[PDB]
Design a protein around this ligand. Structure first.
Ligand SMILES: [Zn+2]
Length: 258
C-alpha cells in the first residue's frame, strides 16, 4: 500500500514502488571509522544561517519538519565538498521507540537516539523541484542526537509539538534560529547518496557531522508523542521512522578531519 515505516509498508517493501531503493548510491550507510579516508583537500563548511526565515512546523505523517523561506540567498550552505550555493529549505528528524536506536547513519554500527536533517538545494538549478532530478541537486547536513544535557535551541521545537500531534496539523513557526541546533565543531564525513524516504532519488551529497548534539531524554520523549495517523483514525505512534543502513557499494567515505 502507501509507503510507511511499518512491517507491511516499511523500508524492506519500498523497492516494489521505488525500484531505485536497490540502487548504487542509496542512503543511509554505516560509517566505518577506519576505511573512511581523510581527504586534506576538503574545505571547511561555510554556513550562513543568520538570515534564515522559518515559516511553519508540520506533521506530514512520516515526521515533522520546519519550513523556511528559501526565496533569497539568506540561509545558505557552501564550502566543504560543494561547488556553488545551496539554500536551506527545511529540516526534520528521525527517532526510535527507545533511546538506543533512531538514527539512520551509524558510526561503526553505533546507533544514536536520533538524527536531524537540514535539507538544501543547489541554486544553479533554479528550484527544489528541478534540483532533485540532478545528482548534485541537494546537500543534506546530518546531525546525530545523543541523550545527555538539554540543547537550549531545540526547546522551542519540542514545545510546539503538542499542538501538531496528528498528520495534517500545521503551526506558524517564525523566528526560529537553526543555529541553536549545531554542534561546536564542523568536522564531517562526506559521501554521495540519496533521499532516505521515497522517492529515494540519488541526488544528495551527504555531510554528516562527527560531533553529535546532546539533548535530554526529557526532550527526546516529546518526539515520541506524535502520531502517524490523522485526526479521527487508528492511533499509531510516530516512532522508529528511520531507514536502516544500505550497502555502501563502490563508494568511499571521506573525512575532513585526520
Ligand atoms: Zn531525513
Amino acid at each position: 500500500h502507501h509507503w510507511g515505516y511499518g512491517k507491511h509498508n516499511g523500508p524492506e517493501h519500498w523497492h516494489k514502488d521505488f525500484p531505485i531503493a536497490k540502487g548504487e548510491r542509496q542512503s543511509p550507510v554505516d560509517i566505518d571509522t577506519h576505511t573512511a579516508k581523510y581527504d586534506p583537500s576538503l574545505k571547511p563548511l561555510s554556513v550562513s544561517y543568520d538570515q534564515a526565515t522559518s515559516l511553519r512546523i508540520l506533521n506530514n505523517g512520516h515526521s515533522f519538519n520546519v519550513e523556511f523561506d528559501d526565496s533569497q540567498d539568506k540561509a545558505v550552505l557552501k564550502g566543504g565538498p560543494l561547488d556553488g550555493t545551496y539554500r536551506l529549505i527545511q529540516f526534520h528528524f528521525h527517532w526510535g521507540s527507545l533511546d538506543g536506536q533512531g538514527s539512520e547513519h551509524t558510526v561503526d554500527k553505533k546507533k544514536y537516539a536520533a538524527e536531524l536533517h537540514l535539507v538544501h538545494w543547489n541554486t544553479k538549478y533554479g528550484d527544489f523541484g528541478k534540483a532533485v532530478q540532478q545528482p548534485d541537486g541537494l546537500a543534506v547536513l546530518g546531525i546525530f542526537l545523543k541523550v545527555g544535557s538539554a540543547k537550549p535551541g531545540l526547546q522551542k521545537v519540542v514545545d510546539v509539538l503538542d499542538s501538531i500531534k496528528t498528520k495534517g496539523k500545521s503551526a506558524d513557526f517564525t523566528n526560529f534560529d537553526p543555529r541553536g541546533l549545531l554542534p561546536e565543531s564542523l568536522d564531517y564525513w562526506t559521501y554521495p547518496g540519496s533521499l532516505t524516504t521515497p522517492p529515494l532519488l540519488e541526488c544528495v551529497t551527504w555531510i554528516v557531522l562527527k560531533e553529535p548534539i546532546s539533548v535530554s531524554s526529557e526532550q527526546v520523549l516529546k518526539f515520541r508523542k506524535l502520531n502517524f495517523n490523522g485526526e479521527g483514525e487508528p492511533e499509531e505512534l510516530m516512532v522508529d521512522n528511520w531507514r536502516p543502513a544500505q550497502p555502501l557499494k563502490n563508494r568511499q567515505i571521506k573525512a575532513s578531519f585526520k
